[PDB]
C-alpha cells in the first residue's frame, strides 16, 4: 500500500482548498478515476485531477 | 487510518450529477461521475481492486 501509491494505483482524491488557488477546473480539462469533482452550492462542477504518483501520501499531507 | 476510514474522511475513487472540501464524485459525451462511498471508501476500493 506504500508501493502501490508510488505507482499511483491508489486514486485518493486531492482536497479542494476552497480558499487557496489550486489546479481545479471542469470535467473537460481533466483529460488535459481520472479526476475528482464537486458541485458547490454556488458553482459549477469543479474537478481536480488525482496525482499521478503518491496520491495517498499527498492527500495525507 | 482505519478509524479515519470508517468515518469516510479519505476519498478513494472506486476502480452524472456532481456531488478544504472533500470531493464527492470521481469522473472519467457528458460528465459521468461515480459517487464515493460514504464510509470505508478505501476498504471498498481495495476489496474491488483484488476482485
Amino acid at each position, epitope marked *: 500500500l506504500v508501493l502501490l501509491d508510488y505507482q499511483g494505483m491508489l486514486p485518493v482524491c486531492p482536497l*479542494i*482548498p*476552497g*480558499s*487557496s*488557488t*489550486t*489546479s*481545479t*477546473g*471542469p*470535467c*473537460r*480539462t481533466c*483529460m*488535459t478515476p481520472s479526476c475528482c469533482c*464537486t458541485k*458547490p452550492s*454556488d*458553482g*459549477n*462542477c*469543479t*474537478c481536480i485531477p488525482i496525482p499521478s504518483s503518491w496520491a495517498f501520501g499527498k492527500f495525507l499531507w | 487510518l482505519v478509524l479515519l476510514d470508517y468515518q469516510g474522511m479519505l476519498p478513494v475513487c472506486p476502480l452524472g450529477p456532481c456531488r478544504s*472540501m472533500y470531493p464527492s464524485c470521481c469522473c472519467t459525451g*457528458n*460528465c459521468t461521475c461515480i459517487p464515493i462511498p460514504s464510509s470505508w471508501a478505501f476498504g471498498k476500493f481495495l476489496w474491488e481492486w483484488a476482485s
Partner: antibody
Amino acid sequence: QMRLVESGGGCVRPGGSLRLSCAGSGFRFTGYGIHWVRQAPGKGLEWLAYISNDGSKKYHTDSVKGRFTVSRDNAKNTAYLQMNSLRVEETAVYFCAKDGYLSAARGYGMDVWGQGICVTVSP
Amino acid sequence: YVLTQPPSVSVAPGQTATITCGGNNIGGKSVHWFQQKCGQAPLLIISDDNDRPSGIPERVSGSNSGNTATLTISRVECGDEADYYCQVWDTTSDQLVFGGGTMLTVL
C-alpha cells in the same frame, strides 16, 4: 442569490484612471476567481482580466497588459480593476463575472455576471 | 487564438437554431456559451460544452468536437433573441477568448 455589483465607472479624461470595485454577495467570494470583461458600445464581449480565488494568479489581455491591474479583497468581498492610462477607444460597459469553479488557477468560464458599469472616456 | 463565430443567425418561432463557434483545437477546450439580450448582462447557458445550468430551458444543448463547437436551441421562442458568445480559456497563452457573437433572430 449570487449577485455582483460593479462600481467606479463614469466619464474620465483620455489618460485618466479608474478602479472598478466589484462587490459580490450570495456566494463564497473567497473561493471563486473574478473575471473582468468589457463590451464596446455595440460590439462584442472582450475579456479584460482575471484574478484567482485568492489573488495568486492574475491574467490580463495583451491590449491592457501593463495598464490594467486586477486586485481583490475577500474580507470585504470585493474585486477591483485599476485601469490606468485610459484611452479614447476604452469606453465600454465593464462587467465583473465570478468564475464557476472553486480555487481554479485559470478562469475556464464565468458563472454569475455583474450588472455592468458603463465607463465613458472623452474630453 | 481566434474563435470564429457566425455574425448572425435567423430562425422562425418553432424551428431550431445552431450557433457554431470554431477554433483550431476547440475539442480540447471547455467551451462556455453565454446569452446576452439587448441592454442586459450576459447569462451563462452552457458550461463544460454541455452542462446546462439551473433554470436554463432544457431546449438549450451545447456540443464540442474537433474544430467546432455548436450551441443548439430547439423550438426557439421570440424571447430567445440575443447575442450568444463562445468562451474558452486558451491555456497556450493563458487568456480567455470570446467569440464574435451570433445575433439570433426569431422573426
